[PDB]
Every structure is written in C-alpha cells, then in structure tokens.
Design a protein around this ligand. Structure first.
Ligand SMILES: [Mg+2]
Ligand SMILES: [Mg+2]
Ligand SMILES: [Mg+2]
Ligand SMILES: [Mg+2]
Ligand SMILES: [Mg+2]
Ligand SMILES: [Mg+2]
Ligand SMILES: [Mg+2]
Ligand SMILES: [Mg+2]
Ligand SMILES: [Mg+2]
Ligand SMILES: [Mg+2]
Ligand SMILES: [Mg+2]
Lengths: 249, 72, 96, 242, 145, 99, 143, 136, 87
RNA sequence: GCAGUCAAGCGUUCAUAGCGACAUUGCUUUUUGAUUCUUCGAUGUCGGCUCUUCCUAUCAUACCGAAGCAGAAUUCGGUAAGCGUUGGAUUGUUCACCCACUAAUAGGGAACGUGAGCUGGGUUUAGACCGUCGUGAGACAGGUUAGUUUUACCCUACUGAU
RNA sequence: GUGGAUUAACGAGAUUCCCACUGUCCCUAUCUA
C-alpha cells in the first residue's frame, strides 16, 4: 500500500500463464459445435472463445499493473531505497512491456471478432479462431523475461520493513563491526544477530520502543566502508540514503 | 518479520527432525510415481504429460551430447 | 437449454406417495436397540391427543440471550390413562 | 486503571455500573468480565450480576451513587427484588416513573452534584434530590443533551467530550467543584461516559485505549499516588506530539 | 386461459411421458408421520386436584380449561404435557416412543421449571382462568339475587 | 496558524473549580478496599476468581451460576425459596408491604 | 374490518390523541409555541394556520375561519372538556392505584382545570380578533 | 459480515421490503430514508429482501439536507410498525418505521435520537444505546 | 464532470430531479431579469423560490402541498423555451 | 503466419537429392507502466412466465498437494455433481455490460426443453402515412401506425380412489 | 434549390414522466352464487 507491499497477488512465467488462461477458456466455455447448426450459432461459438481468451489475458495483466507500486508517486526515501534495491529503468521498462502487451491483446480480440462477423463455414471460423489465439500466444511468449524479473522483485519486496518517514526516529550509524546491532538488541526486541565479522547485516532493520508514552522507531545500518562518492555498493547506498532522507536523530 | 527471515529461523532453530529422510524417500518414490501418472491420467492431462515428457527427454539427451562433445 | 435461473425443488420426494394411511393407528417401525443388562422396560405408550395450551417457564440455558429469563411456550396435552397387558408374542430371526 | 472487554467490545460503561460502594455487572456468556472486576476489587464491595428489563445494557438504564440507585419503569419487580436482596440496606433502590427511561444517559452524578437533561420533570428532579441526596442542575454538555453519555464524573475530577469549549469547561467545573478536562477514550471516541467506568480508586477502560489517553485519565481522576492532576503541565509534550 | 392454480409446463418433448416428480393434484393429509425430540414438560396425575398449579401460581385448579377442551371434554386421568406441536388432530390416537439414540444436546439435558399454566377458555376469547375469578370480576348479576 | 493549532487548547489546559460555597465534599474509600492484598496471577496465594469455579464446573457456556447464592438475608434457609407471585387473579407484589 | 375503517384508521394515517391535546391546551407557553410555528415545506399553510383542538393545519386563514365556525370543531371542543382518560382511570376502575387516581382527579379539578379553561378563553378571543378582516387570497411570500 | 453487532440476533417479523420510505430519527440533517438493500439477507428466486427492527440496511436520502442527498449510506432500523413478538409474551408495534444513519462499523453519525427505540436494537447495537434517551 | 448538467442547457433528456439544474442556473444568472419574469417576493434561496413558484403556478398536491419537482421542471422548461437571458 | 540458425529421427543402413519433431531468434510500441471518455460488442425469429430432470469441462461449501506459504488473506493444482448459485436497471429483445446484496452470484443439454400450457413479436395478408425508385400500374426483408383459430368426454403416461 | 414552417381549442389517435391510490407483486389465505 503506502508503507508496505505485501499485497501484490502473484505473477507467473509466460508458459504457465499461457497454460492457465488457455485451459481456463477450454474448461469454462462449451466445446461441442456441429457442422449442421446455424451459421449464427457457429459465429457466436467462436466469437465467445476469442472474447473470453482476450478478457482472461487482460485481467491477468491488469492485476499486476495495479499491484506493483508506482516508483514516481511514492515518498522520496522509498523511491531511493527501491531504486537502490532494483534498477529503476529495468523496473519501468518491464512494466511498460506488460502494459503494451495488454493493449495488443485487446487489439487482436477486436480485429478478429470483426473478421468472425463474416465467416461462412465452420472451417473458416475455426481457422480464424485459431489464428487469433495463436497471435495472443505469440505476444505472451515474447513477454518471458520481464515476468521472471518481476517475480523476483515481488518476492523480495514483500519481506521489506515498514519505515514511516514522518515519525519519531532514532537512526544508528557507524563502522562495520557490530556495535549498532548489539545496541538495537539492547534497546528493543529484534532478530539482528551480533557477529564479529564486518557485513553481518546486509540490509537495514527497524525496532520499536516507548519513551514518555510515545512510540519511537530505531533504524539499524549496515555500514559505510571508506569510499568517496561512486565506489560504494547498494549496501552502503541504503545507509547514506536513509541518513539523507530520514529527518531523525 | 523484517528482511529475509525464514532462512534466519532455519539457521537459528533448525529444520524438522524428520525433514531429510522425508525428502530422500520422496525422491526415491518419484521414479515409481512418474510412471503411475503416465498410465492413470486420461483426457487432456495425459496429452500434456506426454508433451512434457518428450521435451524433458530431448533436453536431457541434448545436455549429454553437448557435455561429451565439449569436454572431448 | 439450461434453466438460466436456479431454484430449489418444490416438495420432498422421500414422503411419496401422498396417499391415505392404512389405519388410524400409525405403526411403529423401529424400537430402541436391546441392552441385555439393563432392567426390563417398556419402550412405548399410547394415548389420545386433547388440545393445546400455553405455559410460562423460567429458562436456564447458559450461553443464550434468554439465560435467566421468562419465556412463553406452547404445549400439547395427551390424555394417558393406564394400559392393560393381555398377551405376549415371540419372534424368531429367519434369513428373510 | 485497567483495561477489560465485555465480550469483544470496549464500551464498559454500556454493560457496567461502578460506584464507591457497589458494582453492577451484566450477565451473559462467561465469568470473564465479573472475574476482571473481582480480581481488581475483591470482597471489599458487593458485585451484583444482574439484568434490567431483560437487557444487558445496564449502565445506560440505571443511575446511582454511594447513597442510592435508580431503575427505570421498564424494569420488573422480580429484577428489583433481586437487586434489593443482593445489595445491603445502606443503599436504597427507587424505581422511577419518568418518560426518559435511560437514566444513565440523562443524568451524570457523583456523591454531591448531579447534572441532568434539561427536559426532566419536577417530580423526577425532586426524587433525584431525595434518593441520591445531591444538588441537581439542568445543563447541557457543550450543546449535547445526553450528559451521562458525554461526561464521566467522580469525586476527584471529570472528563468531558473533546469538542467542549474552554468557557464551557470553566462554567461546568464551577458548577461541579472538580477539575475538568476534555479527552478521548477507546482510541478516539467522543462518547467518554459510555466507554469507561470510574470511582475514587478505580477506572476500567477498553483494550483499544491508548497510553496517552490512559495517562490523562489517571491524572485527572487522581488514581495512582503519582497523579496530582496538575501533571498535564509536565505531560504536555506527549499531548502536543499526540 | 384455463385457470391459474396450476403448473404451467408438466413436461417436454423428450421423454414423451409425464415424469414421477412433476407435481400433480390429489389427496392431502391423512398420512402417517413420525416426529422426534419433543421434551416432556409435565407428567400429571389424575388425583392431584391441583395438577394445573405451579410453585408460582398458588391456585387450586386442574389443567382442564374453563369450559372443557373444545371437541374433547374434561381430562380426569393422567396426562403428558409435551412442548410444541404433535401430528394429528384432537381426540386421535397417538403412539409415544422412547428415544431411539442417546441425544448429546443440552436441550435433552436441561430441567424445565414451569411458572404458570393457562386455563382460560379456548372456545372463544377467554380472559378468566377460574370461574371464581370470573364471578369476582363481574360481581353479582340479576339471576344471582 | 492557530494557537498551537486549535485542537490542543481545551485538552492541554485543566479547568479549575473556583469554589463558591462552604460545603466540604471529600472522596470516600471504604476501608476494606485499603485492606486488600493485591491479586497476583502467578502465585499460589490467589483468592478464588469465579472464572476458576466456572472452569472446574464445565466450560464457559456450560457452567450455570446460582445468583441466589450471594443474597443477604436474615436466615440462610431462605436463600433457596421462591416468591408466590400470583394467587387468584392478583399479584402478590401489589399487596406486599410492611404493616 | 371491512374497507372504510381500514382506509381511515390505518396506522400510517393515525391522528393525535386527546390527552396530548389536553396537555397542549394547558400551559400557555405551549399555546404560544403552537401558535408561533416556523416555516415548513411539508405542511399545508407552510406550518401556519393551525388549530390546536383539531390538530390539523389549514391552507389559508379564511379556511381556519370557516373551520372555527363549523360543527366538527364544536364536537372536538366538547370532547376536550373533563378528565382526559389516561391509564390511571383503567387501573382504578380495576381497583388498583386508586389513591393515586383520586389525587390526580382532585388535582385536575383544583389546579389544571381552570388554567386550561382560561387559556382556552384567551385563545378564542385572540383568534377572533385576528381572523376578522382577513382577505381570502394569500400572499405566497414566506419571508 | 454482521459488523458492529454484539452477539446474535433472534428472529423478528420483517416489515420493510426493498423500496420503502422510513423516517430519520436522529439530528444528522436528513428527513427520510429510501431502502435499497438489506445487509445479510438470503437468496431466493422472486423474493424481495426485507428488513426488520435492529438490521443494518443501505439507504439513500430523498428529503432533508442538500449535502446528505445523492449518496448511499448505512442505516439501522430502530422502529418497525409491523407487529412482532416478545419472548415474554405479547405482540407489539410502533407508530412508524424509523432508522438512524451509521457508518459500516456500527457507530452513529448524529448525536441524539428522538422518540423511543426498540430494546432489541438497543441491545444489539451499543452505540445506538449510548445516543438514545428513551428505550421502549 | 456532470455531462447531464452540461447537456441540460440543450433540450432536456430524461431528468428525474431538477434540483441540481436549479442551483446551477441560480449561480448562472444575473438578478435583473429573473425577479421580473417570476416576481420573486424576497429571499432568493432555491428552496423558497421553488416554494413560491409552486404556490404561484398552482402545482399543489392533495392537502395543499407544494410539489417541488414539477415546479422546478417548470423553471427548466422556461429555460428550454427561452424566457431567461442567456449567452 | 513469414524469415533465419539449428538437429534427434531422416530420404523404411546415405545428413547436406529432399524432409525434418523439440528448440531458438527476429515482426506487430503514444517504444520509462504512456494514451484510448469506446459498448471499437454481437444478435431478426425469437424473448418472457411456470416447472422438472441430466452432464462435468467445479463458482461456493468438504478433504488433500505445491508455492518466500510468519500470522491473516490469496494464487496454482488433485478427488469430488451430496448441496446451492439472487434482487434490480437498461438500450426493439437477449447475451455482454452496470448497481448492490451474497458462501457464491460456474458452464452446458433435454426439437438452440417448454410457437394448437400461457403470453409480447414474427410466420400472416387486406387500411393509411413519410423517404427512395418507376412515365405508370406498382416496388422496397428503408421507417412508423391498426390489425379473427376457437380440442379433450377417447387411448396411453402421470396423480390420487375402489 | 430560394405546397414549406409554426399554431389556441378539440381527439375511444401515438409516446414519456409526476402526485394520489391500491392483492400488479413480496406471498398467499378466506368467503358467496
Ligand atoms: Mg445452469
Ligand atoms: Mg425397520
Ligand atoms: Mg379457540
Ligand atoms: Mg474433475
Ligand atoms: Mg444433485
Ligand atoms: Mg443476495
Ligand atoms: Mg414460447
Ligand atoms: Mg405449448
Ligand atoms: Mg399493411
Ligand atoms: Mg384498433
Ligand atoms: Mg398554395
């Protein structure tokens, strides 16, 4: 939502997505048509198949395109933390590919329904339905790599802690030997283990406590090594963006 | 729970006591189980299973040929 | 074609045929199962239905909204004079 | 100051009545609510497990202090006999013939002063003065007409609903002779009288009441030893941050 | 056309018969029925002389209403008083059977306490329970003096 | 914009009584309340807590509590009696009074 | 019932009660409150021209004048005369709360009776003074 | 599902089908309420949903304040006028159908309720009981 | 948005409550001609104006009740006919 | 669908005459989730009322399996037809689409069940008007109005009764 | 290409809304020849 994103439903790969939508069409529509029926019955049969497959793909895409957060419509701190964790151009480009594939599926649906309006036989209508479903399948097969990337980023972003940028906040900072994590273990309750090697905490953790009947946060820091401006990894980028963005103590 | 916590619980507490033997027995039963699904499944699921089996067999023989040719 | 508006069936098909009974005295088709260590007991009685009336009871039922409250209920009165024993019949279990 | 629940609701004032010398609990379900009261109180005062008019809303239908108890006309004589049998003779029980049958909604009393609804008959006001032995005053609560539901009052101080004005607080505290503050209860409810019971040595609230609300009502009701009711000047940083 | 207290469609083309489940007209009532789980509220004796009284009523009366049971008469014997409705009409023969299984409900385990039994007239709108109560409410009449 | 913007003023300020009379009115605590040992839920010393009787006499919706078991009467054989409540066409409570 | 009394005395067509109108006709402040009504869109004369005995609203003031002259109004005025028959009369007729009903009767013949009659007299002369030279057409201007 | 109601509700005769006008009994600014749906009603072919005393409905405001109109809101029925049965035995009815405006969590929008309130509604809803001065 | 309130200046399509169009016109008018074509006797709130127009056009109900919808439809029909200044 | 690289079987032992399963890339961007007020719908002999059965290609309810499945809430699968699957609005009508309520508002068959069980509209004419065409009589499946099929007591089936 | 365009009253002419009123309906029951 605003502070936490454990509400994106799920995404699937391209092959499993194709299996889901096409088997759903085959199960939930009727499958028995005859050459001796009327041509309006035959056209309505194949038109229903085309429309149902298109709407299933559009619904599966539209669930994702509203599930994933807008990177340019959130807080600056959350935007910078998400930008460090996963690359912003890869993020925007993958969701743009999802949106374009959605619009192309609606185009295929409309054009082939209009072409099914004038079919004269079961053979002709069957070839038209097969061509429409094959074009949709080719689009979804071209969507392979953004779906795998989006699956990884959803699985990672679900676990992420909930920092309110506009509340009472104690930030801790220092060199890579424990210090800070042991102090957070003392003042709060958490799971940040204390260990004598340097980069034990490769992320940032939140604890909560109560002083004078107010609720305080306390954010732990991985550690900034020694480096000037552009030699740093995303691990140190997390800490310096937390300090740069969190109006805290 | 914060940043990735299931593997921290695994490192702090352990897995189940009967965890490893169950996985070994599952992998041992899978050989009998894939032939039971080739003979019991009917309809469309049988055709889908046969397509997946053909794809897996071609992929495995391609891996064997490519490995022996590249190493030798 | 299908019905397009589902509805449950009108009436119970296990109470067929809706025909007249074979007597005024309805027959007992099952008795409680015998327990050969309990004392000797009769398992039914027969009487005459004589009207209805209304009572008030003081209700004790823990967990309900009418716990420790007064409730008006309808009751039925059955006139039961004593019954008089005149015979005995024995039954053998046959594979029919 | 403790926090309980009736079943899963925080309206303690709806289902309970608490004064200096007796407690009244609504029956129903289990013994958890009665046992919370008995755990906090003991055998020091009688706790009576009763109903009024067949209903469970017994804090909003009855009204009483240290001296007396008032039940509406909708109560039955079996319930009134049960109450007389359970309570001792030092507290007198009167049944009132009054149109406004929610007595706990229309009066707000302690052992000395009672505020009432303005549209209460003269026979009823004379009966309140006779049975409860208090000084009666017709008054609204910042325009609200249900003084028992929108104010919570004891012998030490008083808490009113949070959109009460400062001059209303001044006039009402002069009439009531107690320090009076405005606040919320059960995480921001304006109905402060029907979500919290209180006497001179106890206050019971709901589980959703926050710690600033708890500290403010402990201060204004002078409950703990470290609560001199002027500690809002040292507790002001919590309130300005809140 | 041709009435409205009817079933409109009683069958289709196939099967070319009326089926056994398609709701025709015929006999209603006079069927044999078994109904279970009726609680016994009072077992009354025929010589108690106050078997219509409770421990909250303190009046000497029997269960016979004021004027008799309509189409039946007085009771004058032992009686069973059960809760609710029973199949059949008045003055018909009923068989009462014991419970065929052990019931695990609390309703079969409670203990009923009657507070009052109505004995006003059911032939009309009765509003007196005893004829002495009717005579005491009305007072003395022209034939009484 | 307002005076510590307006939703703090009637809450952070305490209204004072400003006495108008010479009636002394004090809080009252019955001394049995001051003579309590405090209940402590993790001790063997505990009082009884009727929740316990309800636990060992069935469940929550199974235990049936006697409300006549805490009456204050002159005699103790009187605690399980019942009022007659009706005699002929009259209510006993209409006639019940001393003298 | 049949059809007439079902059409007239239905619960959604219920009219005000005599003892409520008696308490209205006592207490001169309530008479002033009932005469000085506010504007209301759902009343016939915009909440004005109201008869207290027959608790109904008139269209114009000339309608109130002819109603006050009529014979239905005299029937209601004759109905609203003595002790107004509350539940206390039914209780004391059964032989219950009899002293309370007797206190009520002597109180209504001592105090509330002549007050109601004096208010009714003042109200009659006030209405006869006001409804004298009134035009038949009405200004729709509600101010 | 049944949100805000403390406990269970026993069966009471339903008086108000979908398409009825009832009064507004609080001082929120409305005059009447038009019933368009009933929360927690069954499904049956041809049967209208119907509300009784103590139920939450979805209503619109037809007469009253200009801000309250043209929007759908929850309401609670507090007076019925169709006769129902008390379990201590008498049948009884009110003079009119009437309800109050509420949020989906059961809390009330107004500050006081005019006229009497059925004790079943007041026992089922605690925020209705805290805002009413006359309970039957 | 109010597509029907935009189209209501054009010939009327299926209006059920004209009391959204009536304050729209009351914002979209100069006072110098409305008080002439209607002879408004005072306060120019929409409710009081619709009340005097119902009692003036004779749009009453059984009892003497001003019907508000019919008379606001009469004002909207006056706007359709074109007896109010507009541009 | 078109174009290219493959490479197990192949041309009943030939690889490159000539195929060629499984793959793999290209081609279809208001190419950084942008625009797109759109229902780009289909449908002309059926639609509605009433009522009963059957299929499983399972929406809900029962029991299981997998998933970065903490809890809660979901997603994807397996068995399974015992049981349910609504009230309205709206364009000629229906589907689709909206508004709710709901555990859920699954999909189909029975002469596209039920055109001499009943009904709006057609089959189905004759009166009249407008538009277009024709010198004209007239025509138009272009538009709008008004318009006659009317058993059962027979045999069987079914429901009850001797 | 400048019979055409309006029209009060009248109509067993055609279409759409409102108030009143109701067994049209929820959801049926009872009575007379
Ligand atoms: Mg179906
Ligand atoms: Mg048998
Ligand atoms: Mg009778
Ligand atoms: Mg299956
Ligand atoms: Mg079935
Ligand atoms: Mg529903
Ligand atoms: Mg048909
Ligand atoms: Mg037919
Ligand atoms: Mg023709
Ligand atoms: Mg004709
Ligand atoms: Mg000419």
């Amino acid at each position: 939502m605003q502070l936490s994103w454990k509400d994106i439903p799920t995404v699937a790969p391209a092959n499993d997505l194709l299996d889901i939508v096409l088997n759903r069409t085959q199960r939930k529509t009727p499958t028995v048509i005859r050459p001796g029926f009327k041509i309006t019955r035959i056209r309505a049969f194949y038109m229903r198949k085309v429309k149902y497959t298109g709407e299933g793909f559009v619904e599966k895409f539209e669930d994702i395109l509203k599930g994933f957060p807008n990177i340019n419509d959130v807080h600056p701190f959350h935007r910078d933390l998400m930008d460090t964790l996963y690359e912003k151009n890869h993020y925007k480009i993958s969701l743009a590919a999802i949106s374009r594939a959605k619009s192309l599926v609606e185009q295929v649906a409309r054009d082939y329904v209009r072409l099914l309006k004038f079919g004269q036989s079961l053979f002709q209508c069957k070839q038209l339905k097969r061509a429409a479903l094959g074009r949709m399948a080719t689009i979804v097969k071209k969507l392979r790599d953004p779906l795998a990337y989006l699956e990884q980023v959803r699985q990672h972003i679900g676990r992420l802690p909930s920092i309110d940028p506009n509340t009472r906040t104690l930030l801790i900072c220092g060199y890579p030997n424990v210090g800070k994590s042991s102090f957070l273990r003392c003042i709060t309750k958490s799971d940040v283990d204390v260990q004598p090697y340097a980069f034990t905490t490769k992320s940032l953790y939140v604890g909560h406590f109560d002083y004078k009947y107010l609720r305080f946060q306390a954010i732990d820091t991985p550690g900034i090594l020694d480096r000037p401006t552009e030699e740093m990894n995303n691990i140190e980028m997390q800490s310096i963006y937390a300090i740069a963005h969190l109006r805290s103590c | 729970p914060q940043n990735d916590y299931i593997e921290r619980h695994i490192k702090q507490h352990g897995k189940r006591l009967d965890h490893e033997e169950r996985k070994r027995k599952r992998e041992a039963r899978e050989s009998h189980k894939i032939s039971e699904r080739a003979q019991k499944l009917t309809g469309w699921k049988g055709k889908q299973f046969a397509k997946k089996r053909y794809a897996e067999k071609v992929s495995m023989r391609k891996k064997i040929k490519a490995h022996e040719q590249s190493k030798v | 074609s299908h019905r397009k508006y589902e509805a449950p069936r009108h009436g119970h098909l296990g109470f067929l045929p809706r025909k007249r009974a074979a007597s005024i005295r309805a027959r007992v088709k099952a008795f409680p199962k015998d327990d050969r260590s309990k004392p000797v007991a009769l398992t039914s009685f027969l009487g005459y239905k004589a009207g209805m009336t209304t009572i008030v009871r003081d209700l004790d039922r823990p967990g309900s909204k009418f716990h420790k409250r007064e409730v008006v209920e309808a009751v039925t009165v059955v006139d039961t004079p004593p019954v008089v024993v005149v015979g005995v019949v024995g039954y053998v279990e046959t594979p029919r | 100051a403790t926090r309980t629940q009736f079943e899963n609701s925080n309206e303690i004032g709806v289902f309970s009545k608490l004064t200096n010398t007796y407690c009244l609990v609504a029956v129903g379900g289990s013994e958890n609510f009665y046992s919370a009261f008995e755990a906090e109180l003991g055998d020091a005062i009688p706790i009576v497990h009763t109903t009024i008019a067949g209903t469970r809303i017994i804090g909003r239908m009855t009204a009483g202090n240290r001296r007396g108890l008032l039940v509406p006309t909708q109560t039955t004589d079996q319930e009134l006999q049960h109450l007389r049998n359970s309570l001792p003779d030092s507290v007198k029980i009167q049944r009132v013939e009054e149109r406004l049958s929610a007595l706990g909604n229309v009066i707000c009393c302690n052992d000395y002063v009672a505020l009432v609804h303005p549209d209460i008959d003269r026979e009823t006001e004379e009966l309140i003065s006779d049975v409860l032995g208090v000084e009666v005053f017709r008054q609204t609560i910042s325009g609200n007409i249900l003084v028992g539901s929108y104010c919570s009052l004891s012998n030490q101080g008083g808490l009113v609903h949070p959109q009460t004005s400062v001059q209303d607080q001044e006039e009402l505290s002069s009439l009531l002779q107690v320090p009076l503050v405005a606040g919320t209860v059960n995480r921001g409810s304006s109905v402060v009288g029907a979500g919290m019971v209180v006497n001179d040595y106890l206050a019971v609230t709901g589980l959703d009441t926050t710690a600033p609300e708890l500290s403010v009502i402990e201060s204004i009701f002078r409950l703990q030893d470290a609560q001199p009711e002027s500690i809002s000047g040292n507790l002001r940083d919590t309130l300005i941050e809140t | 056309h041709r009435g409205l207290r009817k079933v409109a469609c009683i069958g289709a083309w196939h099967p070319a018969h009326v089926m056994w489940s398609v709701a025709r007209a015929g006999q209603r009532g006079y069927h044999s029925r078994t109904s279970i789980n009726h609680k016994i509220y009072r077992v009354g004796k025929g010589d108690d002389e106050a078997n219509g009284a409770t421990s909250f009523d303190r009046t000497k009366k029997t269960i016979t209403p004021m004027g008799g049971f309509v189409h039946y008469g007085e009771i004058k014997n032992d009686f069973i008083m059960v809760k609710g409705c029973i199949p059949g009409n008045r003055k018909r023969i009923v068989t009462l059977r014991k419970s065929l299984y052990t019931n695990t409900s609390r309703k079969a385990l409670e203990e009923v306490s009657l507070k009052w039994i109505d004995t006003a007239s059911k032939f009309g709108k009765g509003r007196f329970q005893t004829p002495a109560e009717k005579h005491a409410f009305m007072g003395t009449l022209k034939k009484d003096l | 914009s307002q005076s510590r913007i307006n939703n703090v003023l009637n809450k952070i300020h305490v209204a004072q009584p400003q006495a108008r009379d010479d009636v002394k009115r004090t809080p009252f605590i019955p001394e049995s309340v001051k003579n309590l040992k405090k209940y402590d839920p993790e001790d063997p010393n505990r009082r009884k807590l009727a929740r316990d009787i309800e636990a060992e006499n069935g469940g929550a919706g199974v235990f049936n509590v006697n409300l006549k078991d805490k009456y204050l009467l002159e005699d103790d054989e009187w605690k399980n009696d019942i009022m007659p409540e009706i005699l002929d066409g009259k209510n006993v409570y209409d006639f019940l009074d001393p003298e | 019932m049949g059809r007439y009394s079902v059409k007239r005395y239905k619960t959604k067509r219920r009219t005000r009660d005599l003892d409520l109108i008696y308490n209205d006709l006592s207490t001169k402040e309530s008479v002033q409150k009932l005469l000085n009504q506010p504007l209301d869109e759902t009343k016939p004369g915009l909440g004005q021209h109201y008869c207290i005995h027959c608790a109904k609203y008139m269209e114009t003031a000339i309608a109130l004048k002819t109603h006050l002259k009529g014979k239905v109004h005299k029937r209601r005025v004759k109905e609203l005369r003595g002790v107004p028959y509350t539940q206390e009369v039914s209780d004391a007729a059964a032989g219950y709360n009899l002293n309370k009903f007797l206190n009520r009767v002597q109180e209504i013949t001592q105090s509330v009776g002549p007050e109601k009659e004096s208010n009714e007299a003042l109200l009659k002369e006030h209405l006869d003074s006001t409804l004298a030279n009134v035009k038949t057409t009405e200004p729709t201007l509600p101010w | 599902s049944g949100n805000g109601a403390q406990g269970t509700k026993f069966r009471i005769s339903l008086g108000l089908p979908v398409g009825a006008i009832m009064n507004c009994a609080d001082n929120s600014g409305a005059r009447n309420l038009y019933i368009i749906a009933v929360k927690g009603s069954g499904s049956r072919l041809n049967r209208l949903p119907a509300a009784s005393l103590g139920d939450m409905v979805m209503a619109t405001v037809k007469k009253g304040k200009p801000e309250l109109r043209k929007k759908v809101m929850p309401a609670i029925v507090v007076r019925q006028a169709k006769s129902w049965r008390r379990r201590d035995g008498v049948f009884l009815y009110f003079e009119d159908n009437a309800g109050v405006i509420a949020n989906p969590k059961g809390e009330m929008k107004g500050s006081a309720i005019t006229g009497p309130v059925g004790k079943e509604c007041a026992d089922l809803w605690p925020r209705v009981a805290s805002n009413s001065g006359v309970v039957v | 948005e109010e597509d029907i309130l935009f189209r209501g200046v054009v010939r009327v399509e299926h209006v059920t409550h004209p009391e959204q169009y009536i304050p729209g016109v009351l914002k979209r008018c100069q006072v110098k001609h409305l008080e002439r074509t209607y002879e408004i006797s005072g306060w120019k709130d929409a409710t009081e104006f619709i009340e005097i127009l119902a009692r003036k056009q004779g749009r009453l109900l059984k009892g003497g009740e001003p019907d508000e919808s019919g008379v606001s439809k009469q004002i909207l029909n006056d706007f359709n006919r074109g007896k109010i200044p507009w541009f």
